[PDB]
Amino acid sequence: NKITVIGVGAVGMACAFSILNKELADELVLIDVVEDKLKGEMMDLQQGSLFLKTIIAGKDYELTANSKLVVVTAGARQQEGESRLNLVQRNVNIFKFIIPNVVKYSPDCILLIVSNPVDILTYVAWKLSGFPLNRVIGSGCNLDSARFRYLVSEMIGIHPSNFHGCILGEHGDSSVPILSGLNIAGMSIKNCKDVHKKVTESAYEIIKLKGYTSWAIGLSVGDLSCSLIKNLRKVHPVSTLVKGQFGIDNEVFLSVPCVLGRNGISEVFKPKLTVEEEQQLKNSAETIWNTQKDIQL
Amino acid sequence: NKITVIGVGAVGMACAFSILNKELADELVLIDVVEDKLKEMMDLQQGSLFLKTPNIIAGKELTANSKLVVVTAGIIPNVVKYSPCILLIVSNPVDILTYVAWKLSGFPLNRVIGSGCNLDSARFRYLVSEMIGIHPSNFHGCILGEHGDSSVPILSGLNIAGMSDVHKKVTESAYEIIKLKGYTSWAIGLSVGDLSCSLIKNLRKVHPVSTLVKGQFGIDNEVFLSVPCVLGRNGISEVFKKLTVEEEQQLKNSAETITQKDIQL
Amino acid sequence: NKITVIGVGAVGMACAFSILNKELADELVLIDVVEDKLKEMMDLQQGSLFLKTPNIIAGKELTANSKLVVVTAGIIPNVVKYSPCILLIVSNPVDILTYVAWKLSGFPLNRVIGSGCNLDSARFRYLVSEMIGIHPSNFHGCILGEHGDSSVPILSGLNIAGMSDVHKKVTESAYEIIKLKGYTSWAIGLSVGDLSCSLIKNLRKVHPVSTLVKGQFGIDNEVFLSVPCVLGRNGISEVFKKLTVEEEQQLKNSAETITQKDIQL
Amino acid sequence: NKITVIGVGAVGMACAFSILNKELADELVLIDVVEDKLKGEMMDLQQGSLFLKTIIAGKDYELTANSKLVVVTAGARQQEGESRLNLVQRNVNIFKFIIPNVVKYSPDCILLIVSNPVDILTYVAWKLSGFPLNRVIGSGCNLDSARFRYLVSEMIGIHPSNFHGCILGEHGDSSVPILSGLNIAGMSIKNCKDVHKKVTESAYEIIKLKGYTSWAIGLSVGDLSCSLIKNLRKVHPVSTLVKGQFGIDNEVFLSVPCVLGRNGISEVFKPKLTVEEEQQLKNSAETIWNTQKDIQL
């Protein structure tokens, strides 16, 4: 029951702190390139071990051998004036170094791709690894939907555990709120598109004010790693291949409700969406693919 | 943060033991008529370390300034005499003994609740989930109406995390538990723990529980059945009020089946 | 990760309900002779959603490949026939029926444990803590020996977070609970939950529980009393073996008080 | 039940993340000076609210009005070649700005001083605030003792909840392991001084590799804020005034086991230590005071 977290930056550390505050790890491996930092981060985590429950750090990937779950957070320092594409591609070449050394020592692990753009990069992981579809997952929209549910529940006077809606598509501006599935404790609403804009926007102001997301995406990967490790068979909107749904014909990844357990994705839901909804998801994949098409793997 | 459970039957204790494991009570109080049993206080008081409630008191006026009262026997004007509070009726039939609880107390409707179909909805949800092959927290659906064989499933709002006979297996399986035992202790204590949490910690969660429903679904008399209610610090805060006709008339049939006018107030 | 509790008495169920609230079992099994009660399975099986264990099975060979066996009646060669596992004896008197459990089974000493003074030490610790005015987790002290009026306090190791009659109040208060009730259900279920946790999750925590003690404190015969034991995945892993004479002779007096040679193996 | 955290750096954020992962806060206020960062940090925390339970950020201290607990983490960028003293003094003048504005809007709050040197600075807080002794606490040795207990428990084959020892004195190199109180589940050991050096050393390599401690000290303040807010009457080694113990005659703060609840410190233990132990604590205060004596408040 070993877990590896590649990249000990703000995301990885917040991922790893959330994985530690959850019983989930027997072993925890942290990986990056600045040795002085890897050690300092593992030593800070194990100075407070009495309050946690679990730690390794280093540069060589043999440390990761036989990880049950490998969370990938490593990204690239984004330049200003750089385009979305040159950004993606630098993160594709970084993956051209990571995923080989992950499969190399853990051919059976579950891959969880957190780094961005997560949809495109979960496709790169699938292609570089050759792993089946079940063992390649992306953080996707799990946080998006969670934030969506919370804000709507706050507009109503109810607890978020009793409000149920989700956001599918690209994890980004072209995501899609599925308003036909909104529910309150067994009651369909038909018995709010602004909240959705607040989420994708709020997610943009953060990256602008602070550079990245760390705390929120760390909790969400905690929500996800919990279902996989402990095999809860829980449902999360996460990036898997949807070629063959909503008319799409390319090998596009994006978030659709999946059931997560020991083996990764146990099945992919095939949603029956409204006309409009099915169109927006098709446009969402048109957006992703209009960029995925131009990457050199 | 005082809590009272009246009736140390097998239920009132399952309710007690479940309200103590959820660590809700600063002061739990057990009242009943036979004392030599009551003085059950000393057992709970002996695994105290394994619990998280400093005070456990039993006897036969000790319920003063309580914020929640669970009735399980087996009463009220003496609860209100010292606990004028939220009273949650667990005794059966819950739909009817909650009409009595509110008339005999004069409390508003927010402070008079019944267990109702909170347990029935929980069990129903599990089985559908154990059937699809997904964790029960991600499948959502409620059964409303009477706590009994007339309850109604709401197929118009089944949901798997924002999406779109098993019933009779839940009401039938409740019978076998009465026959094979007589009383139902462990399961109702959980559902009462689940409810007591939202009430005490003001979670404002939605539970199908018994309160006034006249005005909904074409009912014309003061019946209390399980409607999805927003439970919190102040008892009930809002009541959700409109589904398929196939089911709304099922809700009057279940109110029709709901003995009301055959006892004296 | 299968767990078995034999004897659906009031204890075996408090033990069951407490082992399910700590969410330890992938598969809980209840065995006993009278079936119409046994088929208590359906209540626990009805608040399933409020628990975290997919399987609850009762009957009269179903205990196969179990990792823990709690004996509470009210047996063994049939536990071992299918569960050759850790057996934790809760039946009374625990000090003696754990000698029987190990001889009749042939298990090594690590896989034969008794509740013993784990509950007695927990309650004792609370009262001293409620007396000083500090949280019970920060005061540490155990009572060893026989589960009864002969147990020994270890004043030579009382501690408040690394520092330096209440006893008789704990053993006396155990009597009143038998008289006023007959059985002790809720409190022993907690102590058995506390123990079952370390065992199942391999916490390697230290609990005063019943195992072989001949060799310690000048005892000369095969008596099992409560010694501080390191409980884990494999049952007992180490046994802590030397305190004031005032107290070590108290440990033989408690073993002296320990009926042994008056029943047939 | 409001909690304020002054300083939204690595310590404060790790403090605040640990306060949030614990039910403890109704309101949570974050405070510093870089507006662009305060907002970005509060927006990252409230994007993952569904997984937490509670948030404010800003520069003006009126936000903090009537805080039940005010955690102070703000420190100064330590220069190289700067001496321990010029360092302390810059953190004293920073406190000359903080503590007035804390008392100004929350005259009844509990002060928890985390910034370093915590012992000296808890004395500065007491003097600047005029608050009684119970409402001025310092993180002190709570983490030190916790780490001590864990490492020793790991050398034995037991769980840390069944090993009990503590470290008192300066939170630093002159701290003192009280070996006379070591215990295992009701048994005194007399029925290891190396672990202590590993802790104070490990705490130094961290500051060198990473600049600061964040994760560990964030958990420890979580352990502390839990007892105060929820009023557990729990015992922690924390910086309070010890003038009148172990021969000390100056108004020196340092960690001695205290009972913590709604009102802060409910009582201060008066330990009965071995000869040696009582000497080291006297030397530990000699060390602290050899620096406290030279600060200008």
TrEMBL record, chains B, C:
Any one of the GO CC terms: cytoplasm
Biological process terms in GO annotation: lactate metabolic process
Keywords of this entry: Cytoplasm, NAD, Nucleotide-binding, Oxidoreductase
Membrane-spanning segments: none
Annotated binding of NAD(+), by residue: G7, V8, G9, A10, V11, G12, D32, K37, G74, V90, S91, N92, S115, H147
Domain Lactate/malate dehydrogenase N-terminal: from-to ranges: 2-114
Main location: cytoplasm
CDD domains in the cross-refs: LDH_1
Family annotation (InterPro entries): L-lactate/malate_DH (IPR001557), L-lactate_DH (IPR011304), L-lactate_DH_AS (IPR018177), Lactate/malate_DH_C (IPR022383), Lactate/malate_DH_N (IPR001236), Lactate_DH/Glyco_Ohase_4_C (IPR015955), NAD(P)-bd_dom_sf (IPR036291)
Enzyme Commission number, as recorded: 1.1.1.27
Location in or out of the cell: Cytoplasm
Protein family per UniProt: Belongs to the LDH/MDH superfamily. LDH family.
HAMAP family xref list: Lactate_dehydrog
Cited PANTHER family: L-2-HYDROXYCARBOXYLATE DEHYDROGENASE (NAD(P)(+)), L-LACTATE DEHYDROGENASE A CHAIN
Name this polypeptide is given: L-lactate dehydrogenase
Native species: Babesia microti (strain RI)
